[PDB]
Design an enzyme around this catalytic site. Sequence first.
Site, mmCIF file in Angstrom:
data_model
loop_
_atom_site.group_PDB
_atom_site.id
_atom_site.type_symbol
_atom_site.label_atom_id
_atom_site.label_comp_id
_atom_site.label_asym_id
_atom_site.label_seq_id
_atom_site.Cartn_x
_atom_site.Cartn_y
_atom_site.Cartn_z
ATOM 1 N N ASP A 67 24.353 31.806 -22.119
ATOM 2 C CA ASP A 67 25.372 30.780 -22.331
ATOM 3 C C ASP A 67 25.771 30.091 -21.033
ATOM 4 O OD1 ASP A 67 27.278 29.487 -24.300
ATOM 5 O OD2 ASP A 67 28.709 30.314 -22.843
ATOM 6 N N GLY A 95 15.431 20.730 -36.211
ATOM 7 C CA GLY A 95 14.067 20.596 -35.746
ATOM 8 C C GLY A 95 13.100 21.311 -36.673
ATOM 9 N N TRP A 96 11.815 20.989 -36.515
ATOM 10 C CA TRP A 96 10.817 21.533 -37.437
ATOM 11 C C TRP A 96 10.809 23.058 -37.392
ATOM 12 C CZ3 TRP A 96 7.926 19.755 -41.406
ATOM 13 C CH2 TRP A 96 6.922 20.607 -41.888
ATOM 14 N N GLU A 143 14.573 19.348 -41.683
ATOM 15 C CA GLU A 143 13.327 18.759 -42.170
ATOM 16 C C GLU A 143 12.739 19.625 -43.287
ATOM 17 O OE1 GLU A 143 10.816 18.117 -38.625
ATOM 18 O OE2 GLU A 143 12.445 17.110 -37.586
ATOM 19 N N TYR A 144 13.210 19.464 -44.533
ATOM 20 C CA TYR A 144 14.156 18.460 -45.038
ATOM 21 C C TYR A 144 14.874 19.087 -46.229
ATOM 22 C CZ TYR A 144 11.189 15.328 -42.417
ATOM 23 O OH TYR A 144 10.503 14.696 -41.412
ATOM 24 N N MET A 211 11.989 9.290 -38.418
ATOM 25 C CA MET A 211 10.813 9.793 -37.694
ATOM 26 C C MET A 211 9.535 9.135 -38.194
ATOM 27 S SD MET A 211 12.169 13.719 -37.213
ATOM 28 C CE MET A 211 12.693 14.002 -38.927
ATOM 29 N N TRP A 402 10.870 10.706 -29.323
ATOM 30 C CA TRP A 402 10.619 12.112 -29.039
ATOM 31 C C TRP A 402 9.408 12.188 -28.114
ATOM 32 C CZ3 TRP A 402 13.024 16.644 -30.261
ATOM 33 C CH2 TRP A 402 12.298 17.825 -29.992
HETATM 34 C C1 LIG Z 1 -0.112 22.022 -41.368
HETATM 35 C C2 LIG Z 1 0.457 21.667 -39.986
HETATM 36 O O1 LIG Z 1 -0.242 21.208 -39.137
HETATM 37 N N1 LIG Z 1 1.870 21.901 -39.704
HETATM 38 C C3 LIG Z 1 2.398 21.543 -38.347
HETATM 39 C C4 LIG Z 1 3.572 20.599 -38.565
HETATM 40 O O2 LIG Z 1 3.095 19.405 -39.185
HETATM 41 C C5 LIG Z 1 4.094 18.818 -40.008
HETATM 42 C C6 LIG Z 1 5.134 18.123 -39.153
HETATM 43 O O3 LIG Z 1 4.534 17.512 -37.971
HETATM 44 C C7 LIG Z 1 5.881 17.059 -39.860
HETATM 45 N N2 LIG Z 1 6.527 16.181 -38.838
HETATM 46 C C8 LIG Z 1 7.913 15.800 -39.089
HETATM 47 C C9 LIG Z 1 8.545 16.367 -40.368
HETATM 48 O O4 LIG Z 1 8.502 15.098 -38.305
HETATM 49 C C10 LIG Z 1 4.960 16.198 -40.692
HETATM 50 O O5 LIG Z 1 5.879 15.287 -41.147
HETATM 51 C C11 LIG Z 1 5.549 13.938 -40.872
HETATM 52 C C12 LIG Z 1 4.515 13.628 -41.926
HETATM 53 O O6 LIG Z 1 3.187 14.174 -41.835
HETATM 54 C C13 LIG Z 1 4.474 12.114 -41.885
HETATM 55 N N3 LIG Z 1 4.065 12.228 -43.240
HETATM 56 C C14 LIG Z 1 5.127 12.080 -43.922
HETATM 57 N N4 LIG Z 1 4.929 12.218 -45.219
HETATM 58 C C15 LIG Z 1 6.087 12.010 -46.011
HETATM 59 C C16 LIG Z 1 3.587 12.570 -45.693
HETATM 60 O O7 LIG Z 1 6.306 11.771 -43.309
HETATM 61 C C17 LIG Z 1 5.988 11.752 -41.914
HETATM 62 C C18 LIG Z 1 6.674 13.023 -41.378
HETATM 63 C C19 LIG Z 1 7.780 12.556 -40.422
HETATM 64 O O8 LIG Z 1 8.842 12.153 -41.321
HETATM 65 O O9 LIG Z 1 4.195 17.009 -41.691
HETATM 66 C C20 LIG Z 1 3.311 17.903 -40.952
HETATM 67 C C21 LIG Z 1 2.531 18.742 -41.918
HETATM 68 O O10 LIG Z 1 3.413 19.349 -42.815
HETATM 69 O O11 LIG Z 1 4.264 20.297 -37.281
HETATM 70 C C22 LIG Z 1 4.749 21.554 -36.725
HETATM 71 C C23 LIG Z 1 5.583 21.195 -35.542
HETATM 72 O O12 LIG Z 1 5.023 20.059 -34.954
HETATM 73 C C24 LIG Z 1 3.586 22.475 -36.359
HETATM 74 O O13 LIG Z 1 4.130 23.680 -35.819
HETATM 75 C C25 LIG Z 1 2.740 22.772 -37.572
HETATM 76 O O14 LIG Z 1 3.446 23.693 -38.449
HETATM 77 C C1 LIG Z 2 11.653 25.609 -28.942
HETATM 78 C C2 LIG Z 2 10.573 25.901 -29.982
HETATM 79 O O1 LIG Z 2 10.889 26.238 -31.078
HETATM 80 N N1 LIG Z 2 9.160 25.762 -29.640
HETATM 81 C C3 LIG Z 2 8.138 26.059 -30.694
HETATM 82 C C4 LIG Z 2 7.492 24.768 -31.152
HETATM 83 O O2 LIG Z 2 8.495 23.991 -31.803
HETATM 84 C C5 LIG Z 2 8.476 22.586 -31.546
HETATM 85 C C6 LIG Z 2 7.127 21.941 -31.718
HETATM 86 O O3 LIG Z 2 6.605 22.316 -33.021
HETATM 87 C C7 LIG Z 2 7.223 20.450 -31.645
HETATM 88 N N2 LIG Z 2 5.975 19.759 -32.079
HETATM 89 C C8 LIG Z 2 5.542 18.582 -31.334
HETATM 90 C C9 LIG Z 2 4.266 17.854 -31.771
HETATM 91 O O4 LIG Z 2 6.165 18.205 -30.392
HETATM 92 C C10 LIG Z 2 8.298 19.873 -32.551
HETATM 93 O O5 LIG Z 2 8.724 18.571 -32.439
HETATM 94 C C11 LIG Z 2 9.197 17.888 -33.609
HETATM 95 C C12 LIG Z 2 10.674 18.166 -33.926
HETATM 96 O O6 LIG Z 2 10.860 19.479 -34.473
HETATM 97 C C13 LIG Z 2 11.019 17.050 -34.941
HETATM 98 N N3 LIG Z 2 12.390 16.520 -34.761
HETATM 99 C C14 LIG Z 2 12.333 15.341 -34.211
HETATM 100 N N4 LIG Z 2 13.429 14.571 -33.900
HETATM 101 C C15 LIG Z 2 13.270 13.251 -33.286
HETATM 102 C C16 LIG Z 2 14.787 15.035 -34.185
HETATM 103 O O7 LIG Z 2 11.085 14.919 -33.960
HETATM 104 C C17 LIG Z 2 10.122 15.841 -34.512
HETATM 105 C C18 LIG Z 2 9.246 16.388 -33.348
HETATM 106 C C19 LIG Z 2 7.847 15.752 -33.333
HETATM 107 O O8 LIG Z 2 7.155 16.035 -34.555
HETATM 108 O O9 LIG Z 2 9.604 20.545 -32.274
HETATM 109 C C20 LIG Z 2 9.447 21.970 -32.559
HETATM 110 C C21 LIG Z 2 10.801 22.614 -32.505
HETATM 111 O O10 LIG Z 2 11.437 22.350 -33.736
HETATM 112 O O11 LIG Z 2 6.329 24.986 -32.068
HETATM 113 C C22 LIG Z 2 5.380 26.025 -31.647
HETATM 114 C C23 LIG Z 2 4.515 26.349 -32.832
HETATM 115 O O12 LIG Z 2 5.290 26.962 -33.834
HETATM 116 C C24 LIG Z 2 6.057 27.313 -31.174
HETATM 117 O O13 LIG Z 2 5.057 28.130 -30.558
HETATM 118 C C25 LIG Z 2 7.164 27.059 -30.189
HETATM 119 O O14 LIG Z 2 6.618 26.579 -28.930
#
Ligand SMILES: CC(=O)N[C@H]1[C@H](O[C@H]2[C@@H](O)[C@@H](NC(C)=O)[C@H](O[C@H]3[C@H](O)[C@H]4N=C(N(C)C)O[C@H]4[C@@H]3CO)O[C@@H]2CO)O[C@H](CO)[C@@H](O)[C@H]1O
Ligand SMILES: CC(=O)N[C@H]1[C@H](O[C@H]2[C@@H](O)[C@@H](NC(C)=O)[C@H](O[C@H]3[C@H](O)[C@H]4N=C(N(C)C)O[C@H]4[C@@H]3CO)O[C@@H]2CO)O[C@H](CO)[C@@H](O)[C@H]1O
Length: 499
Positions: A67, A95-96, A143-144, A211, A402
Amino acid sequence: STRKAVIGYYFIPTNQINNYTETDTSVVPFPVSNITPAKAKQLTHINFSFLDINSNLECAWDPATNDAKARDVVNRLTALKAHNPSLRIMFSIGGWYYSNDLGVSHANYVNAVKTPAARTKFAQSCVRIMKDYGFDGVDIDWEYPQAAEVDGFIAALQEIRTLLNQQTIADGRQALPYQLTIAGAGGAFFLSRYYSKLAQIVAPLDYINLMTYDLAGPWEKITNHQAALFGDAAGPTFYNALREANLGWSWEELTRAFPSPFSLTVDAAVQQHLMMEGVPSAKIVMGVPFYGRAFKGVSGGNGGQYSSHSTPGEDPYPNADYWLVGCDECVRDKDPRIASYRQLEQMLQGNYGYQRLWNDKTKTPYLYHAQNGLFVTYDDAESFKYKAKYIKQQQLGGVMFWHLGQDNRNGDLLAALDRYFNAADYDDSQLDMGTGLRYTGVGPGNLPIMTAPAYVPGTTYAQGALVSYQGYVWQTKWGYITSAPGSDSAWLKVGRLAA
Ligand SMILES: CC(=O)N[C@H]1[C@H](O[C@H]2[C@@H](O)[C@@H](NC(C)=O)[C@H](O[C@H]3[C@H](O)[C@H]4N=C(N(C)C)O[C@H]4[C@@H]3CO)O[C@@H]2CO)O[C@H](CO)[C@@H](O)[C@H]1O
Ligand SMILES: CC(=O)N[C@H]1[C@H](O[C@H]2[C@@H](O)[C@@H](NC(C)=O)[C@H](O[C@H]3[C@H](O)[C@H]4N=C(N(C)C)O[C@H]4[C@@H]3CO)O[C@@H]2CO)O[C@H](CO)[C@@H](O)[C@H]1O
């Protein structure tokens, strides 16, 4: 007129907080000191990412967070406000990784919004966190929420809004009031989860940050631009899931709003928001990526576009083959599928075998590695010219990206966006937006202005006839019609009359 928002996410994982340093990029690649005064002046919002919702159903830091170190990092960000009295340091929850359907904290999101009492506890914790650490507003990046969680989500946003407004009064912050935003889906499949209630979701927000990227990636069979502005007829198309949303609209109304298949583009997502009544353009913020998505195993012919590919989708990346030639950051991050703009510039400049190509329909750049069969979709200062012009033409609220650590060292992408919105000497009146495919859907919220002869009782109207009546332009769905427009099912409201 009103300054366009420029919202940059500052993403810092827990281990980087706990080991925070400004003098060792192998520990913290992008410390706060890299956000210079000049960059701080070009931002309106910096969104600290990410906080979470814990099992007590409260907004919380990751429990592994030190903290004292967390407060020090946030304090360095809020000190930037000395250079920009319009700047806000938001914090983002979700975040994702935390909040996706299979994410480690997902059930906490569902449960925090589920009941009035849970929503009150959650909303209070958000404002407490934002006051305790010195943040300027709350951003939700779940999300989401699914179609059934949407009502609770809406009520949670409404409750946070009321508490933030109370806090603005208590702190006399009318000049820079505390804000509430969400990061929203930028494609129709995820958007369909809450699309029917979009007006309720947006009403308590200052902005919805679309996004509008990740529209391609390893989860699709065919390579594509991840953030095409407009469509390319040679590229893939997608089912329009919005036409199955619980809207209560007729066949003609659904068809006019939701062409299917359609091109998954930034323009499509923006128009899909505008089509809904009560969703004001000024609240819509266009997201852009500061990173590219890379694919391997692509077969040429069209620069790697619209090709099959052999890119794994798993996480973590399933082996140690870091095949994105020249991507040193990819080795560090053990993943060849993502490269910052910062890195992409170096890859293009070095002897690594990439061509930079341009798609003049989508208005986006891409890298093609002909020898190895690699394709990279990304955005740059040139694609941002067209996206900035679109933001101005469509009267959107601004731009979001981002993330800050992925701009190059000089902050060129951020500087470009600031220039296209604010530089007195920048002129894009002649910038040709091209002939890429526009999203043609029309809904109740974006009726075009039209003229037509006044409706005349007793006249028999053939199919397709256009009349003006009681403020609107109407079109018969079949013939022959004699009813007054709006009195039965025969007339489609297709336009509005100018006042
Ligand atoms: C199977 C896989 O590779 N999973 C990835 C994961 O992929 C996600 C996210 O990147 C989503 N990104 C978001 C929610 O911002 C992604 O959503 C995208 C999407 O593909 C575009 N398509 C849509 N649709 C409505 C089809 O909307 C946009 C959104 C953004 O709104 O979907 C993919 C696959 O599910 O990404 C994570 C983290 O980057 C990675 O760990 C891995 O689990
Ligand atoms: C801190 C942490 O959890 N690190 C995880 C890592 O999480 C990341 C990545 O999956 C990012 N993927 C990419 C392509 O950068 C991911 O970015 C997402 C984010 O969640 C969504 N929200 C936004 N905003 C604008 C609010 O944009 C998208 C971006 C782009 O798709 O962020 C997550 C954290 O939520 O994932 C890896 C695999 O699981 C893990 O090892 C660890 O490093």
